Scaffold this active site. Sequence first.
Site, short mmCIF file in Angstrom:
data_model
loop_
_atom_site.label_atom_id
_atom_site.label_comp_id
_atom_site.label_asym_id
_atom_site.label_seq_id
_atom_site.Cartn_x
_atom_site.Cartn_y
_atom_site.Cartn_z
N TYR A 157 0.79 -1.14 0.05
CA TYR A 157 -0.05 0.08 0.20
C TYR A 157 0.83 1.17 -0.05
O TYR A 157 1.92 1.38 0.54
CB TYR A 157 -0.78 0.02 0.97
CG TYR A 157 -0.39 0.40 2.59
CD1 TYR A 157 -0.18 1.78 3.13
CD2 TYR A 157 -0.02 -0.91 3.18
CE1 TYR A 157 0.35 1.77 4.23
CE2 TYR A 157 0.52 -0.70 4.63
CZ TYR A 157 0.87 0.75 4.95
OH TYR A 157 1.20 0.99 6.30
N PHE A 173 3.00 10.51 4.20
CA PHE A 173 2.85 9.60 3.12
C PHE A 173 3.50 8.10 3.84
O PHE A 173 4.71 8.36 4.02
CB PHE A 173 3.56 10.28 1.75
CG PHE A 173 2.78 9.72 0.44
CD1 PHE A 173 2.53 8.38 0.53
CD2 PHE A 173 2.68 10.52 -0.47
CE1 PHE A 173 2.09 7.82 -0.90
CE2 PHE A 173 2.14 9.92 -1.70
CZ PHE A 173 1.71 8.53 -1.66
N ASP A 174 2.62 7.27 3.73
CA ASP A 174 3.17 6.19 4.69
C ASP A 174 2.81 4.94 3.51
O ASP A 174 1.96 4.91 2.80
CB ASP A 174 2.27 5.60 5.54
CG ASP A 174 2.28 4.25 6.21
OD1 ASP A 174 3.53 3.80 6.36
OD2 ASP A 174 1.28 3.63 6.48
N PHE A 192 -5.50 5.69 -0.10
CA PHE A 192 -4.50 4.79 -0.19
C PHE A 192 -4.61 4.08 -1.82
O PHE A 192 -5.66 4.19 -2.50
CB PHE A 192 -5.20 3.56 0.67
CG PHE A 192 -5.07 3.82 2.15
CD1 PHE A 192 -6.26 4.41 2.73
CD2 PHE A 192 -3.91 3.26 2.87
CE1 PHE A 192 -6.09 4.35 4.13
CE2 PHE A 192 -3.90 3.38 4.34
CZ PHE A 192 -4.88 4.12 5.07
N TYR A 235 -10.67 6.87 11.27
CA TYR A 235 -10.23 7.36 12.68
C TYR A 235 -11.11 8.67 13.12
O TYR A 235 -10.84 8.83 14.39
CB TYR A 235 -8.74 7.88 12.88
CG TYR A 235 -7.45 6.78 12.22
CD1 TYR A 235 -7.50 5.71 13.12
CD2 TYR A 235 -7.14 6.87 10.96
CE1 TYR A 235 -6.49 4.96 12.56
CE2 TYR A 235 -6.32 5.59 10.57
CZ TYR A 235 -5.94 4.77 11.32
OH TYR A 235 -5.10 4.07 10.97
N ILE A 249 -8.51 -0.09 9.79
CA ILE A 249 -9.84 0.44 9.88
C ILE A 249 -10.63 -0.19 8.85
O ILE A 249 -10.54 -1.00 8.10
CB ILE A 249 -9.45 2.12 9.16
CG1 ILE A 249 -8.74 2.09 7.73
CG2 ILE A 249 -8.50 2.99 10.21
CD1 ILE A 249 -8.70 3.22 7.27
C1 LIG Z 1 -2.80 5.45 13.03
O1 LIG Z 1 -1.56 4.75 13.08
C2 LIG Z 1 -1.22 4.57 11.94
C3 LIG Z 1 -1.67 4.76 10.85
C4 LIG Z 1 -1.12 4.10 9.59
C5 LIG Z 1 0.28 3.54 9.71
C6 LIG Z 1 0.87 3.43 11.11
C7 LIG Z 1 0.19 3.89 12.22
O2 LIG Z 1 0.79 3.60 13.30
C8 LIG Z 1 0.80 2.26 13.69
O3 LIG Z 1 1.93 2.66 11.31
C9 LIG Z 1 2.72 2.35 9.76
C10 LIG Z 1 3.68 1.37 10.11
C11 LIG Z 1 3.01 -0.14 9.76
C12 LIG Z 1 4.12 -1.36 9.85
N1 LIG Z 1 2.04 -0.54 10.55
C13 LIG Z 1 0.86 -0.47 10.10
C14 LIG Z 1 -0.08 -0.69 11.03
N2 LIG Z 1 0.71 -0.54 12.25
N3 LIG Z 1 2.03 -0.55 11.86
C15 LIG Z 1 -1.38 -0.49 11.05
C16 LIG Z 1 -2.23 0.47 11.89
C17 LIG Z 1 -3.34 0.93 11.58
O4 LIG Z 1 -3.54 1.47 10.20
C18 LIG Z 1 -4.74 1.32 9.31
O5 LIG Z 1 -5.68 0.55 9.61
C19 LIG Z 1 -4.49 1.78 8.04
C20 LIG Z 1 -4.90 0.46 6.93
C21 LIG Z 1 -3.47 -0.37 6.82
C22 LIG Z 1 -2.18 0.41 6.61
C23 LIG Z 1 -1.90 1.39 7.83
N4 LIG Z 1 -3.37 2.42 7.81
C24 LIG Z 1 -3.07 3.63 8.34
O6 LIG Z 1 -4.13 4.29 8.60
C25 LIG Z 1 -1.79 4.57 8.40
C26 LIG Z 1 -1.76 6.08 7.86
C27 LIG Z 1 -2.25 6.18 6.49
C28 LIG Z 1 -2.56 7.60 6.16
C29 LIG Z 1 -1.27 8.42 6.20
C30 LIG Z 1 -0.52 8.20 7.82
C31 LIG Z 1 -0.37 6.69 8.17
#
Ligand code: A1INT
Length: 128
Positions: A45, A55-56, A118, A101, A75
């Site tokens: 992703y 940007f992640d 995404f 969120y 989410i």
């Molecule tokens: C709100 O906290 C974060 C949000 C998001 C990423 C985060 C995060 O901190 C935990 O870390 C990224 C590192 C990676 C290995 N990872 C992914 C998750 N945990 N660790 C999953 C965590 C929850 O994420 C989601 O549910 C969604 C969809 C799956 C991919 C990650 N997602 C995010 O919301 C991202 C976020 C996207 C928008 C820009 C900033 C990061």
Amino acid sequence: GAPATVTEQGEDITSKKDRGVLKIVKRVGNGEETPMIGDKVYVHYKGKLSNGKKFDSSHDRNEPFVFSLGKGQVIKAWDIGVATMKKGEIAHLLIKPEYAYGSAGSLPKIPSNATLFFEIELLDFKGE
Ligand SMILES: COc1cc2cc(c1OC)OCC[C@@H](C)n1cc(nn1)CCCOC(=O)[C@@H]1CCCCN1C(=O)[C@H]2C1CCCCC1
């Protein structure tokens, strides 16, 4: 660019039809199966706040992102959107805060009332 394109052209894949999760298929996948609740799902992703700040991407970790669909590990919008994808598909999702969120947010990465964008590539999925 991409977020506005989804606003204009995306399919509303919500059950409520509240435009909470909008989708465009960018690259077509293979097969008849789509992930179901419980399945272990493998993706790449690219994500960001729709306002282009933060940007992640899984590539940053040099490894696919793996989660179980429906298990509250991601989410709501992902549970909804990835369940609509075929293996090999790349899709764009644009997501209102109610499917991400919410009003609380998740600081410091996610502010209150954030819309998220995404690009997701579905690599594989396997049954519990
Ligand atoms: C709100 O906290 C974060 C949000 C998001 C990423 C985060 C995060 O901190 C935990 O870390 C990224 C590192 C990676 C290995 N990872 C992914 C998750 N945990 N660790 C999953 C965590 C929850 O994420 C989601 O549910 C969604 C969809 C799956 C991919 C990650 N997602 C995010 O919301 C991202 C976020 C996207 C928008 C820009 C900033 C990061």
